[PDB]
Amino acid sequence: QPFVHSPEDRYQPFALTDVQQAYLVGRQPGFALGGVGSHFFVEFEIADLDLTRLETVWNRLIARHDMLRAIVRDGQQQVLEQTPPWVIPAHTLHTPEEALRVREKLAHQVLNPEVWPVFDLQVGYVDGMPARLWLCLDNLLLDGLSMQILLAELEHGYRYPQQLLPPLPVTFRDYLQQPSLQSNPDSLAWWQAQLDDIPPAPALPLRCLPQEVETPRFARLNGALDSTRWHRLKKRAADAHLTPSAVLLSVWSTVLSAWSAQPEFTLNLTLFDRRPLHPQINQILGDFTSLMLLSWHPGESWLHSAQSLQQRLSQNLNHRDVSAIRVMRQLAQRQNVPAVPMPVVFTSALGFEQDNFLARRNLLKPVWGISQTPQVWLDHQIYESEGELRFNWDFVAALFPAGQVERQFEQYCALLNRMAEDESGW
């Protein structure tokens, strides 16, 4: 199948993906949460910031990546051909407390997707301290993998500002227009065949009704598993006939089981892999997200339920052309309820060749970040960098009893490290 380019329609409107549609309606009150945006915010520290150089690098990226010039207009998405160069706002701050107040303001801003730009990038100079770079990107337009690609290019361009990259020979707009993305065969039937075996989302203790949260604010807990333990864990996984993702999903689900009203539950898995329709498809920015339900059914031993989860994961992956968005509608109809939410999410950026993403010695040193997703209470995100497994839980703090998420994270980290070191649980 040869890829079909349409350069004459590069700036014409094109349809939103299912995920993008869900994000847009997620700005309003929903069945599982109040309205909230969908952006991704990171604060960097830069010693000896050269603003002119950073501005050059960032504007080159805007010109290079069509979806940085994209907007949502009249219920569709559209790439703007020419946008005014981004002149980086710079704040002059005297104390880190002043910088914190700016961080808090920018980290919870509302990106209006109808007016370019659907991003924000500002800098803050702190007297006698490294300068701050506050970057806000929207998952409505750039998925998790895309933001790793963009952040690595930003870091690379700032370190080596003399290098010029050749233009990209393929666009996200054309990718969505390809025939493969318009072909559901037995996948819809296969999912419908097991609606009666998909339990609800984790029944975690709440401190209030999630709909009674008018302005959801996300918080982050982050951790890492050292490279020696991550290597050993992946080896134990292989010996146990499990993928690394299945092990992490199984360790996480064990903690979630201990807290939930029912031990069995269903998670929503966020994946980023792309159909290989063009040899450079993995270099571009866009929304390639696929959503897939995965159910945890505990057994006698952790290993049994992990192996059972792996098998289910392998089968489910063979039917991702039917997204979890549709399966949740099918579940709601079979159960005669208005909606079946899945607000507990696992997001994996493993296996995408982004080695040394946010590497230790980066000039743009990440120090603080947060991400928001509508209709999601708890989002466990993972990626690998420098041989190390890095993870973070993004969650609506106000939803849960004080100390609860912090305690689950503590238990999860402890269980993760012990199973990497101790052969007992296997």
Contact 49, 138 (CB under 8 A): no
Within 369-388, the residues that bind Na ion by CB under 5 A are 371, 373
**Total residues interacting with Na ion, rule: CB under 5 A:** 5
> Which CB sits closer to Na ion, 40 or 352?
40
- In Å, how far are 133, 169, 195 from 156, measured between CA atoms? 15, 20, 47
Instruction: Tell whether residue 268 is a contact of Na ion (CB under 5 A).
Output: no
- Angstrom distance (rounded) from CA 293 to CA 266: 7
> Which CB sits closer to Na ion, 250 or 371?
371
> Which CB sits closer to Na ion, 41 or 302?
41
> Which CB sits closer to Na ion, 38 or 408?
38
The distance of closest approach from Cβ of residue 136 to Na ion in the complex, given in angstroms and rounded to an integer, is 10
Instruction: Tell whether residue 38 is a contact of Na ion (CB under 5 A).
Output: yes
The distance of closest approach from Cβ of residue 414 to Na ion in the complex, given in angstroms and rounded to an integer, is 28
The residue with tokens 């910088």 is 99
- In Å, how far are 121, 155, 356, 357, 364 from 361, measured between CA atoms? 22, 11, 10, 11, 9
Instruction: Tell whether residue 20 is a contact of Na ion (CB under 5 A).
Output: no
The distance of closest approach from Cβ of residue 348 to Na ion in the complex, given in angstroms and rounded to an integer, is 15
The distance of closest approach from Cβ of residue 250 to Na ion in the complex, given in angstroms and rounded to an integer, is 25
> Which CB sits closer to Na ion, 281 or 370?
370
Contact 36, 375 (CB under 8 A): no
Residue nearest to Na ion (CB): 139
Within 117-146, the residues that bind Na ion by CB under 5 A are 139
Burial state string for 254-291 with b = 16 or more CB within 10 A and e = fewer than 16: bbbbebbeebbbbbbbbbbebeebbeebbebbbbbbbb
The distance of closest approach from Cβ of residue 265 to Na ion in the complex, given in angstroms and rounded to an integer, is 23
- Angstrom distance (rounded) from CA 237 to CA 425: 12
Contact stretch for Na ion (CB under 5 A) within 36-44, 210-218, 240-248, 330-338: 36-44
The distance of closest approach from Cβ of residue 30 to Na ion in the complex, given in angstroms and rounded to an integer, is 15
Q: What is the DSSP string of 78-143?
A: EE-S--------EEEESSHHHHHHHHHHHHT----TTSS-SEEEEEEEETTS-EEEEEEEETTTS-
Contact stretch for Na ion (CB under 5 A) within 37-45, 114-122, 168-176, 285-293: 37-45
Overall residue count recorded for the chain in this entry: 426
The distance of closest approach from Cβ of residue 180 to Na ion in the complex, given in angstroms and rounded to an integer, is 26
Contact flags string 333-372 toward Na ion, x per CB under 5 A: --------------------------------------x-
Where on the chain is the footprint of Na ion (CB under 5 A)? 38, 40, 139, 371, 373
